[PDB]
Amino acid sequence: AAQTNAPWGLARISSTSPGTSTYYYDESAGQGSCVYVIDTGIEASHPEFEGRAQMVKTYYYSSRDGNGHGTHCAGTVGSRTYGVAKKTQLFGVKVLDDNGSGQYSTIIAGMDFVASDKNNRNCPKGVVASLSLGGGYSSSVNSAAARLQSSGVMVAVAAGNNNADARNYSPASEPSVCTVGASDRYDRRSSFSNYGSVLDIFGPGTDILSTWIGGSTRSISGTSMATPHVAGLAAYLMTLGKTTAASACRYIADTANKGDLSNIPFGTVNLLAYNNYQA
Ligand SMILES: [Ca+2]
Ligand SMILES: [Ca+2]
């Protein structure tokens, strides 16, 4: 399939070169996969989700995304126009309040929730969790992410936007999940993107157009925006059977565009998520 005039990020993840504007992807589009978006919730009523998004869990008075971030990242995972996996099932886990903040314990509970709740969902092609959140290092947040990964969910996490070594952030630093840095449309490491040896992959993270609450759209930046690209990519690849939850981060790194990003510090992978789709 070809989505013309796609968001640059989508076009990039299906391209060996920057600066193209068509997103190419297998029409399976992550059908039969599920992506949990563990964030501020999802405006499931957004027409871009086509009824494929639902809230399954909140730790607040409402499952409504009063913030937009989780709606934005869900849109990059799987909205019809802005999504990588345009047919995946999106499950909203509101671990972040409408200010985008969430206690570590709530975040940990939500990760554990996903690890069990996937047994309540139909995801024959596999389960992904997009964690577009991040705080300072926490062994228990890292361990929660590692349990979620261990349960058979492909966990993508934002490397964080501190322009620092992600070793000091969580769940970015958890080695068994997929820690995602951010790049821009000129294939530079996003100025804010964390880096370091724990990074597994880069995805488009600057000026990512995607869904927003109130049925709108918005372009924002962050490794939090790169994360759903990789999450959506993992769902897409698992639907194609190219990989599994356990192997997806390794597969995405193996098949990434290599050595194409600029301003990658020494020691950080120079890998850009790439769907390897040959139209
Ligand atoms: Ca987003
Ligand atoms: Ca890793």
Side-chain angles (χ1 to χ4, degrees):
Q3 181 192 345
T4 57
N5 299 293
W8 79 262
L10 303 189
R12 192 68 189 84
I13 60 147
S14 62
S15 173
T16 53
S17 306
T20 68
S21 66
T22 308
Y23 175 33
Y24 305 112
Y25 59 99
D26 192 279
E27 54 146 25
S28 56
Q31 174 71 67
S33 70
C34 314
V35 186
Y36 287 81
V37 185
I38 310 172
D39 206 274
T40 63
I42 308 177
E43 186 173 279
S45 68
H46 198 306
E48 279 280 319
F49 296 122
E50 308 179 303
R52 288 178 290 103
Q54 63 190 95
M55 286 304 297
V56 298
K57 179 74 184 194
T58 180
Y59 298 87
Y60 308 89
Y61 58 85
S62 180
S63 57
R64 168 183 169 276
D65 177 14
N67 178 281
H69 217 276
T71 291
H72 189 273
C73 287
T76 297
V77 175
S79 91
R80 55 194 193 184
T81 307
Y82 311 99
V84 167
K86 297 174 186 301
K87 294 277 165 202
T88 191
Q89 291 283 314
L90 304 164
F91 296 129
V93 180
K94 184 174 180 50
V95 298
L96 306 179
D97 58 45
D98 289 336
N99 275 310
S101 66
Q103 291 304 300
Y104 270 171
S105 62
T106 293
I107 292 173
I108 287 172
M111 292 200 256
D112 280 320
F113 173 82
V114 173
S116 165
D117 176 72
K118 68 163 143 58
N119 299 313
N120 295 318
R121 314 293 162 191
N122 293 293
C123 315
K125 298 313 198 168
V127 188
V128 183
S130 187
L131 280 74
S132 291
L133 45 88
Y137 183 84
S138 175
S139 58
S140 67
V141 167
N142 274 4
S143 149
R147 292 196 296 280
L148 183 58
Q149 179 71 48
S150 184
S151 63
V153 180
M154 191 282 188
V155 184
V157 310
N161 314 318
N162 326 85
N163 186 31
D165 197 307
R167 82 210 302 160
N168 286 322
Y169 298 93
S170 286
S173 57
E174 163 51 42
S176 64
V177 305
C178 210
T179 302
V180 186
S183 66
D184 75 1
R185 75 195 313 141
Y186 304 102
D187 270 356
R188 323 184 188 99
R189 176 181 60 103
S190 309
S191 48
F192 50 79
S193 190
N194 282 353
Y195 49 85
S197 61
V198 74
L199 259 78
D200 300 292
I201 189 65
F202 282 82
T206 71
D207 309 334
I208 302 312
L209 175 56
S210 172
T211 47
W212 198 256
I213 48 169
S216 86
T217 65
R218 181 163 313 202
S219 183
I220 43 185
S221 304
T223 57
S224 154
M225 322 313 167
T227 309
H229 285 91
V230 172
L233 183 48
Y236 167 91
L237 292 173
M238 292 180 344
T239 288
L240 288 168
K242 302 268 195 41
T243 190
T244 56
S247 294
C249 194
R250 208 183 289 249
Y251 181 90
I252 283 160
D254 287 351
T255 59
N257 282 310
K258 311 172 171 6
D260 287 318
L261 297 173
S262 62
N263 197 38
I264 301 300
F266 205 82
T268 297
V269 295
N270 197 327
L271 303 168
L272 188 56
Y274 177 47
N275 78 353
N276 263 98
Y277 180 68
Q278 300 314 315

